[PDB]
Design a protein around this ligand. Structure first.
Ligand code: HEM
Ligand code: HEM
Ligand code: HEM
Ligand code: HEM
Lengths: 149, 147, 151, 149
């Protein structure tokens, strides 16, 4: 966890890429959350096994349980971005976040299923501001969660 | 009951204004305010320490720091939902899932209101208003209806 | 007046609102840069606009012209205002009607104001790259049409 | 104008207080604008004569013309606050802003009618984060507009 936190917090390039991309996503957090979940289930349908409670995830916004989850997910991302200046905060916020994910038996490898879906979401929402380095920044941040699981 | 109460919150312009104004003050310092709210809870309702046993000694605690920051982002989520009934209902119901599982009753959850009043009084100073407390109690009641 | 009926439909069209907020997220990364780009495109495809903007001086100078720079930045905060109004029809109507007052006084007709749509498309192509889609332009054209109805 | 811009941009404390107080006000842009206008007309009813087009301003939010003005006013403040890191930007944005106010024959002294209404609005919305330094920062920013009129 400490090494993963240091990789993110010690890099001005990673932090700048996370802040600019989050700024863009924050124009519509509900649409962002729904788009991320859609990309997760389309690219990584294997992950649907973890989301039985949500019912028919193909329904998108019209599924109120999926909608509540998609919106709520973005507030964890908001907290992570607001933690980037402070390694001690990013550490304790990620370890807090990890508790329920550990309880649901989501391994670091399983959680990593989010990475390519996040890359596609970034491509579809950032226009020409998208870069490989932006995707890399998000993979590093997801790496902090993976280390905690 | 969640629907009835959520509809009345979304329809009450004066109450939403009090929620957003006071939230503007509470959210200046997400970390500090979160810790203040939790400390008030533990002082007032000692039984809460037991529900929060995983945090260890809550009397310098990183687990409590992580929890208290994270709590404030659920409040942000509620405040951001105040203009859309269906959004408010779905975020409240999502929030409730884990609280139901931990066996936190509507009565136990209402232990947060007094601690929120004390937090508001500490943060609002000379502009503290009892009507603001009533507004927060109304929002908390939407959540209680989901438990 | 067609303002109220057009505003009703903008507020009720969720997919179109999503297109407006998504594309706005990209357009607003660089408020100054994008505002200047939009104005440059306006002068390119409607050179007649130079006459209405004569107070700004030499618009070919871009950011090096402080009057053009100030206008171009300020224009983007009116777009922010419109985007922030999309979920509430009374809010959208009152901000559009407010905005229209000075434009009416400048004798800018609905047809002249619509000259901004091409420039919006070109700016969107530059900002969106490979992910550009005409659906975003149709969304902006619907919002522009609410303003046009007020003129 | 240049001297007034230099005072604002030359103090890290003025800029910090403008940004932090704006963050609070931005929790409810519409309520902020309406509250500021109500304070203007209560503390300075003499200024009502500049606003004939808006009709019965005592009606507040229920008056759609007043509501449109109150919301729109805040987007000029947003622009000013976003201009603080670049003196040349603050200058060109304030000079642009001033054009219509000059056309309305609003003097620097008349525009300064907003200062005390703004102080009251800050006290009402900031709780214990209010201080006289915050009021001073806003007086300095308004001073830039006054110098341009
Ligand atoms: C960007 C990555 C992610 C973020 C920010 C995120 C955030 C959240 C948040 C905030 C919650 C609600 C609080 C909680 O119960 O823990 C949640 C619930 C959940 N997370 Fe994640 N998570 C992410 C990735 C994943 C992935 C990849 C999986 C599965 C492989 C997963 C499975 C779940 C499940 C099953 C729930 C409970 C869903 C429900 O029944 O409502 N999460 N997550
Ligand atoms: C304003 C009221 C409250 C808010 C906004 C809030 C929010 C949260 C959030 C966001 C989490 C983490 C996600 C999750 O696991 O569900 C959480 C966890 C928790 N909540 Fe609450 N909650 C509140 C009131 C309460 C009360 C009154 C109790 C019990 C007396 C309680 C008991 C807990 C417990 C035990 C956890 C798990 C703690 C841990 O081990 O880290 N909650 N809550
Ligand atoms: C997206 C479309 C547009 C937006 C958001 C926009 C916004 C603005 C704003 C915020 C101002 C400053 C406040 C005011 O004086 O009204 C302004 C001024 C102006 N607008 Fe527009 N407007 C747009 C389209 C147009 C078009 C198409 C024309 C004419 C072809 C036009 C002509 C002007 C003129 C002449 C001024 C005064 C410029 C100066 O001397 O500084 N506008 N507009
Ligand atoms: C914080 C201070 C102020 C801000 C940010 C502000 C901003 C604005 C903005 C953005 C507009 C619309 C664009 C335009 O037409 O210029 C406007 C219009 C106006 N301003 Fe101000 N202004 C402020 C103070 C004042 C004061 C103190 C007065 C009068 C003494 C005044 C008189 C007006 C008038 C009469 C209009 C046109 C109203 C209408 O008929 O819709 N302004 N102002």
């Amino acid at each position: 966890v400490d090494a993963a936190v240091a990789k993110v917090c010690g890099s001005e390039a990673i932090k700048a890429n996370l802040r600019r991309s989050w700024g863009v996503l924050s124009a519509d957090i509900e649409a962002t959350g729904l788009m991320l979940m859609s990309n997760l289930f389309t690219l990584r349908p294997d992950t649907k096994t973890y989301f039985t409670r949500l019912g028919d995830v193909q329904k998108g916004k019209a599924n109120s349980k999926l909608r509540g989850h998609a919106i709520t997910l973005t507030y964890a991302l908001n907290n992570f971005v607001d933690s980037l200046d402070d390694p001690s905060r990013l550490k304790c916020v990620v370890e807090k976040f990890a508790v329920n994910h550990i309880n649901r038996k989501i391994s670091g490898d399983a959680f990593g299923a989010i990475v390519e879906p996040m890359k596609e979401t970034l491509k579809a929402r950032m226009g020409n501001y998208y870069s490989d380095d932006v995707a890399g920044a998000w993979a590093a941040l997801v790496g902090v969660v993976q280390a905690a699981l | 009951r969640v629907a009835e109460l959520a509809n009345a919150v979304v329809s009450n312009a004066d109450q939403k204004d009090l929620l957003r104004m006071s939230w503007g003050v509470l959210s200046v310092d997400m970390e500090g305010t979160g810790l203040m709210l939790m400390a008030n809870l533990f002082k007032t309702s000692p039984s809460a320490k037991g529900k929060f046993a995983r945090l260890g000694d809550v009397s310098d605690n990183s687990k409590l720091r992580g929890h208290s920051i994270t709590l404030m982002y659920a409040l942000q989520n509620f405040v951001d939902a105040l203009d859309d009934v269906e959004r408010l209902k779905c975020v409240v119901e999502k929030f409730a899932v884990n609280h139901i599982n931990r066996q936190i009753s509507a009565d136990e959850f209402g232990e947060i209101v007094g601690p929120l009043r004390q937090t508001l009084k500490a943060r609002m100073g000379n502009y503290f208003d009892e009507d603001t407390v009533a507004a927060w109690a109304s929002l908390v009641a939407v959540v209680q209806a989901a438990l």
